[PDB]
């Protein structure tokens, strides 16, 4: 009996300035929708398009591949919900790919104890950029942060690693086990989630 | 010595973009948050008429000399609006101190970036064409309007366009640094 409630595009994100995805949610207090349609146009165009890929980003999502993605150009977009009883449109959402960038977490976080000769020992942390970011051409630039803590400490230690993919931590407590995570942001944009923890036992003879 | 110039160019560019970004936000949070100024910001940029790469593949397809001149044209083209932005804001009775300090820093740093870029051009392409052909901005009457809604939205676009172009310049420098110094093995 009811047409759909007013849906909302509530999130867009680009993992790497080459593609992006948007997510919408059904309005509450309206009918069940049997179809959704996301349409948009771009700044300086008139020409209206459909979402090119409803599958890839999963449920209630529009994914813009490389051939539909560009920077420094506003997307003006809207989703409609329809059933046999009627229809409802979202607010228009204005999106610049430039400002929704959030990389995936860094990969292969590895940690080691190094005890060299007659010089202070250290924790040596190593990682890799998320896959599918193009650092080599200068298209993308990544900065990294490390955090670490033993179980039950009230605070994390944070170490800014800039653009390096390895880092050295000196003063650690001998005998303590530490959880170590890494995350990354673009030069402009949002931090990724933290990577899963790797664990390291700092030995007694430190 | 290319590596020092580029390093310094990219430090400036990233700093300028960061300031343009924070300026646009602060202006927005405290003047335009409540309205459809964003919908009036559409297509309003004095540099849009330049042929700029819109993605990594166009960036790659672009001749290096032309790419550098493009960055130069964009920066030359912003000397004028940055000058009137500062002038207009500074001339206010009770002028927003955080917004004004950014605009001033962006104004100064843009000049310096343009010098580093000029130094880079004459090092990498020393027998260059010495011809300005940058796009003209002529939006000063709209910053100067008495209709406050119209004024606020001219400003909004100016800051919106500055945030985009400063971003763009910064990104194009990074591409060129990687290509020129590292053969795209950054
Ligand atoms: Cl963030
Ligand atoms: Na995506
Ligand atoms: Na979908
Ligand atoms: Na693209």
Swiss-Prot record, chain A:
<feature type="domain" description="Fibronectin type-III 2">
    <location>
        <begin position="105"/>
        <end position="205"/>
    </location>
</feature>
<feature type="binding site">
    <location>
        <position position="187"/>
    </location>
    <ligand>
        <name>Zn(2+)</name>
    </ligand>
</feature>
<comment type="function">
    <text>This is a receptor for the anterior pituitary hormone prolactin (PRL). Acts as a prosurvival factor for spermatozoa by inhibiting sperm capacitation through suppression of SRC kinase activation and stimulation of AKT. Isoform 4 is unable to transduce prolactin signaling. Isoform 6 is unable to transduce prolactin signaling.</text>
</comment>
<comment type="similarity">
    <text>Belongs to the type I cytokine receptor family. Type 1 subfamily.</text>
</comment>
<protein>
    <recommendedName>
        <fullName>Prolactin receptor</fullName>
    </recommendedName>
</protein>
<feature type="domain" description="Fibronectin type-III 1">
    <location>
        <begin position="3"/>
        <end position="104"/>
    </location>
</feature>
<feature type="binding site">
    <location>
        <position position="188"/>
    </location>
    <ligand>
        <name>Zn(2+)</name>
    </ligand>
</feature>
<feature type="glycosylation site" description="N-linked (GlcNAc...) asparagine">
    <location>
        <position position="35"/>
    </location>
</feature>
<feature type="topological domain" description="Extracellular">
    <location>
        <begin position="2"/>
        <end position="206"/>
    </location>
</feature>
<feature type="disulfide bond">
    <location>
        <begin position="12"/>
        <end position="22"/>
    </location>
</feature>
<feature type="glycosylation site" description="N-linked (GlcNAc...) asparagine">
    <location>
        <position position="80"/>
    </location>
</feature>
<comment type="subunit">
    <text>Homodimer upon hormone binding. Interacts with SMARCA1. Interacts with GH1. Interacts with CSH. Interacts with NEK3 and VAV2 and this interaction is prolactin-dependent.</text>
</comment>
<feature type="disulfide bond">
    <location>
        <begin position="51"/>
        <end position="62"/>
    </location>
</feature>
<feature type="short sequence motif" description="WSXWS motif">
    <location>
        <begin position="191"/>
        <end position="195"/>
    </location>
</feature>
UniProtKB/Swiss-Prot annotation, chain B:
<dbReference type="GO" id="GO:1903489">
    <property type="term" value="P:positive regulation of lactation"/>
</dbReference>
<dbReference type="GO" id="GO:0016525">
    <property type="term" value="P:negative regulation of angiogenesis"/>
</dbReference>
<keyword id="KW-0421">Lactation</keyword>
<dbReference type="GO" id="GO:0038161">
    <property type="term" value="P:prolactin signaling pathway"/>
</dbReference>
<dbReference type="GO" id="GO:0007595">
    <property type="term" value="P:lactation"/>
</dbReference>
<dbReference type="GO" id="GO:0007565">
    <property type="term" value="P:female pregnancy"/>
</dbReference>
<dbReference type="GO" id="GO:0005148">
    <property type="term" value="F:prolactin receptor binding"/>
</dbReference>
<keyword id="KW-0597">Phosphoprotein</keyword>
<keyword id="KW-0372">Hormone</keyword>
<dbReference type="GO" id="GO:0031904">
    <property type="term" value="C:endosome lumen"/>
</dbReference>
<feature type="modified residue" description="Phosphoserine">
    <location>
        <position position="153"/>
    </location>
</feature>
<dbReference type="GO" id="GO:1902895">
    <property type="term" value="P:positive regulation of miRNA transcription"/>
</dbReference>
<protein>
    <recommendedName>
        <fullName>Prolactin</fullName>
    </recommendedName>
</protein>
<feature type="modified residue" description="Phosphoserine">
    <location>
        <position position="77"/>
    </location>
</feature>
<dbReference type="GO" id="GO:0005576">
    <property type="term" value="C:extracellular region"/>
</dbReference>
<dbReference type="GO" id="GO:0007166">
    <property type="term" value="P:cell surface receptor signaling pathway"/>
</dbReference>
<comment type="function">
    <text>Prolactin acts primarily on the mammary gland by promoting lactation.</text>
</comment>
<comment type="subunit">
    <text>Interacts with PRLR.</text>
</comment>
<feature type="disulfide bond">
    <location>
        <begin position="178"/>
        <end position="186"/>
    </location>
</feature>
<keyword id="KW-0964">Secreted</keyword>
<dbReference type="GO" id="GO:0031667">
    <property type="term" value="P:response to nutrient levels"/>
</dbReference>
<dbReference type="GO" id="GO:0046427">
    <property type="term" value="P:positive regulation of receptor signaling pathway via JAK-STAT"/>
</dbReference>
């Amino acid at each position: 009996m009811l047409p759909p409630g007013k849906p909302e595009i509530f999130k867009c994100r680009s993992p790497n300035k080459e593609t992006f995805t948007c997510w919408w949610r059904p309005g509450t207090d309206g009918g069940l929708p049997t179809n959704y349609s996301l349409t948009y146009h771009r700044e300086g165009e008139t020409l209206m398009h459909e979402c090119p890929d409803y599958i890839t980003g999963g449920p209630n999502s529009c994914h813009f591949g490389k051939q539909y993605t560009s920077m420094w150009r506003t997307y003006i977009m809207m989703v409609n919900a329809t059933n046999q009883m009627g229809s409802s449109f979202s607010d228009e959402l204005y999106v610049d790919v430039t400002y929704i960038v959030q990389p995936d977490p860094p990969l292969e976080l590895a940690v080691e104890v190094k005890q060299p000769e007659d010089r202070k020992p250290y924790l040596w942390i190593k990682w890799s950029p998320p896959t599918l970011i193009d650092l080599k051409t200068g298209w993308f630039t990544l900065l990294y942060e490390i955090r670490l803590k033993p179980e039950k400490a009230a605070e994390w230690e944070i170490h800014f690693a800039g653009q390096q993919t390895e880092f050295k931590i000196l003063s650690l407590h001998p005998g303590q086990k530490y959880l170590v995570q890494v995350r990354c942001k673009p030069d402009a944009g949002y931090w990724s989630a933290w990577s899963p923890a790797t664990f390291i036992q700092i030995p007694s003879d430190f | 010595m290319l590596r020092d110039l580029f390093d310094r160019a990219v430090v400036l560019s990233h700093y300028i973009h960061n300031l343009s970004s924070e300026m646009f936000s602060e202006f927005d949070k405290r003047y335009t948050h409540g309205r459809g100024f964003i919908t009036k910001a559409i297509n309003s940029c004095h540099t849009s008429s330049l042929a700029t790469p819109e993605d990594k593949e166009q960036a790659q397809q672009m001749n290096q000399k032309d790419f550098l001149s493009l960055i130069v044209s964009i920066l030359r083209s912003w000397n004028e609006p940055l000058y009137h932005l500062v002038t207009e804001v500074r001339g206010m009775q009770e002028a927003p101190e955080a917004i004004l300090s950014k605009a001033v820093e962006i104004e100064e740093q843009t000049k310096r970036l343009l010098e580093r870029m000029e130094l880079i051009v004459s090092q990498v392409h020393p027998e260059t064409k010495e011809n300005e052909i940058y796009p003209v901005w002529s939006g000063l009457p709209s910053l100067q309007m008495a209709d406050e809604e119209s004024r606020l939205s001219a400003y909004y676009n100016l800051l919106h366009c500055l945030r985009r172009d400063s971003h763009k310049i910064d990104n194009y420098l990074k591409l060129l640094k990687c290509r020129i110094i590292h053969n795209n093995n950054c």
